[PDB]
Amino acid sequence: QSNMTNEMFDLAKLKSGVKNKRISSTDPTGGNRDHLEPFKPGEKRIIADIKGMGVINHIWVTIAPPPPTLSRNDIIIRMYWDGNDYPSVESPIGPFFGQGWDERYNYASLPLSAGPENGTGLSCYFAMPFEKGARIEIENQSDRNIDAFYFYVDYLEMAKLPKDMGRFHAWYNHNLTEALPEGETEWGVTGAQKPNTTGERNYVFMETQGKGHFVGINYYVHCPTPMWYGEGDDMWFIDGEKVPSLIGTGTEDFFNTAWCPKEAFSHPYFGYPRVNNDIGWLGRTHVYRFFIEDPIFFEKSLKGTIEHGSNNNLTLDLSTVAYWYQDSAVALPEAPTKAQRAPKPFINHVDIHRWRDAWRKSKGNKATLWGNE
């Protein structure tokens, strides 16, 4: 028999052992109230409770009111596989679907998109297998109601889950990173640069034990300086090795870009859906990269890290969502609190004028200092 194969060729093949199912917020009366009842502040609800074996292969969500009225940073999505009492997916729902902070913007990637109206249509095509059921939970951590929650959870019921199917995991992390004691010595501008010989101060976006593969990252940086935020290298520790086997060259480099960019760009596997649009790199940037053709495999463990500026010199407000598969459904590290992951204010002309004043006083408060001395 011919070994011919590819996406469109295989689509033409008849498939066995699959049955479509869908859980949605459809009005059970047949009327047009096709959303769930409101969520009060703090309320949690299991929106999908599936029994047996299957594979989720399409999720769509929308929420009312839209941002900024209701921030999607403050609505949590959690997923529990195989009857476990811990979630294997835990993230603020906006960041999970590639919508950072309390913002909204259209973008499309192969697994995740936020489509019209202006980033409110959330869709996910990651496949999520399960053997002993699946539960999807929504938690309202906002101070106001979720007036209407709309969704589709499309999945294939299977009499027998194939051999070697993994379990989908996703974890949101956040850190307000610590500058070096000598200060933010990026590019050696304010002081001498030093080597990062351990990666111990790197930001950690993923850390797990098991067998599997890493498949994606949504990276949300809020930079409080106009200085370039992305000199930092990605560094991966596979299966408990002491020296990281995968070491990068820069953050834009890791995201398949170059030369300190700040341009919107779209590829099915990587892109910049939101750029800072200000002096230098001051403000917010969202970058993503999916490792679909090129996952990062591990047999025993994986620790995915990235420098926050060269040798971790910069103070950055960083949040990430990491996506991966592993052999069984495992627990995640404790989530950041609502207060910990709150979006920070944009540095503005008043703040920078105060920096200029401190700088002028450090130079003897000479009446004709330009600013480049």
- Beta strands 301-306 and 203-209: pairing type? antiparallel
Using CB under 5 A as the binding rule, the residues of this chain from 220 to 249 that contact Na ion are 231, 233, 247
Among 20, 342, 24, 359, smallest CA distance to 174 is for: 342
Binding mask 162-181 for Na ion (x = CB under 5 A): --------------------
Q: Any contact of residue 26 with Na ion (CB under 5 A)?
A: yes
**Smaller CB separation from a copy of itself, 130 or 171:** 130
Among 285, 311, 318, smallest CA distance to 190 is for: 311
| In the complex, minimum distance from the CB of residue 250 to a copy of itself, in angstroms, rounded to a whole number | 6
Q: Can you tell me the distance from the alpha carbon of 350 to that of 362, in angstroms, rounded to the nearest whole number?
A: 19
Tokens matching residue 322: 């990491």
Q: Any contact of residue 105 with a copy of itself (CB under 8 A)?
A: no
Q: Can you tell me the distance from the alpha carbon of 305 to that of 312, in angstroms, rounded to the nearest whole number?
A: 11
> What dihedral angle (degrees, nearest 10) is formed by the CA atoms of 245, 250, 255, 257?
-130
- Residues paired with 277 in a beta bridge: none
**Smaller CB separation from a copy of itself, 56 or 87:** 56
Q: Any contact of residue 14 with a copy of itself (CB under 8 A)?
A: yes
| Residues near Na ion (CB under 5 A), total | 9
**Smaller CB separation from a copy of itself, 49 or 294:** 294
Q: Which amino acid is at 46?
A: I
Q: Which amino acid is at 85?
A: D
Kindly tell me the number of DSSP H helices and DSSP E strands found in the chain.
4, 22
Using CB under 8 A as the binding rule, the residues of this chain from 130 to 149 that contact a copy of itself are none
- Stretch of residues binding a copy of itself (CB under 8 A), selected from 41-49, 69-77, 82-90, 263-271: 263-271
| CA-to-CA separations, 78 to 3, 85, 175, 192, in angstroms, rounded | 40, 11, 21, 45
**Smaller CB separation from a copy of itself, 14 or 339:** 14
Binding mask 68-97 for a copy of itself (x = CB under 8 A): ------------------------------
**Smaller CB separation from Na ion, 90 or 233:** 233
**Smaller CB separation from Na ion, 27 or 299:** 27
- From the list a copy of itself, Na ion, none, which binds 238 (C-beta under 5 to 8 Å, kind-based)? a copy of itself
Q: Identify whether the C-beta of residue 92 lies closer than 8 Å to the C-beta of residue 43.
A: no
Q: Which residues bind Na ion (CB under 5 A)?
A: 26-27, 32, 34, 197, 231, 233, 247, 250
